[PDB]
Amino acid sequence: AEPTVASVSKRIMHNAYYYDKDAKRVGTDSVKRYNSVSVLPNTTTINGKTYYQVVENGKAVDKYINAANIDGTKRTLKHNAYVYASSKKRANKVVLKKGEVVTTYGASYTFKNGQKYYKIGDNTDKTYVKVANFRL
Ligand SMILES: [Cl-]
Ligand SMILES: [Cl-]
Ligand SMILES: [Cl-]
Ligand SMILES: [Cl-]
């Protein structure tokens, strides 16, 4: 009966638009990683994509966040991979191995070197893996 008793505060892991039920961007705001937003805990599906419905001022509103930006996407490495903070800087000494399941959070990032990277890790750390390592 009260959306604000049911709501959970999810951490945004990739900057996120608000969408309406027609999967069109609504308004001019976006939630920035790694801020949190109040949503209903059960996802819904709009045009074959998974979303969380926003709760604002006591009510479930016609504003939806793509679950890719909160839960991310489970992916498998097709190649061994390093973890990068930026184009040239390694984040750590980890070697992720071919076949490992890794969750990536939202759309890839093109770095200054022109290569694409996904954010990994259930945390605010600057830890990115090359998109190429998820493809054959
Ligand atoms: Cl944005
Ligand atoms: Cl988005
Ligand atoms: Cl690599
Ligand atoms: Cl963290």
Residue numbers in the entry: 310 to 445
Provide the publication's sentences verbatim.
The SlpA protein (~46 kDa) is the main structural component of Lactobacillus acidophilus ATCC 4356 S-layer, built of two domains. The N-terminal region is involved in the self-assembly of the S-layer, whereas the C-terminal part is involved in the attachment to the cell wall. The amino acid sequence of the C-terminal SlpA_III domain is sequentially conserved among Lactobacillus. It consists of two adjacent repeats of the “SlpA-motif,” the “Surface layer protein A motif/domain” (InterPro: IPR024968). This domain is involved in the binding to TAs (teichoic acid binding domain; TAB domain), one of the components of the bacterial cell wall. The crystal structures of the TAB domains (SlpA_ac_III, SlpA_amy_III, and SlpX_ac_III) reveal high structural similarities. The general structure of the TAB domain consists of two cell wall binding motifs (SlpA_motif) which are connected by a short linker and arranged as an internal homodimer. Mapping of the surface charges indicates a large, highly positively charged region within the interface of the two motifs that extends to the C-terminal part of the protein. The four residues observed in the vicinity of phosphates are conserved with the proposed binding motif of YxY….KxxN. SlpA_III, the teichoic acid binding domain, is not involved in the self-assembly and protrudes inward to the bacterial cell.
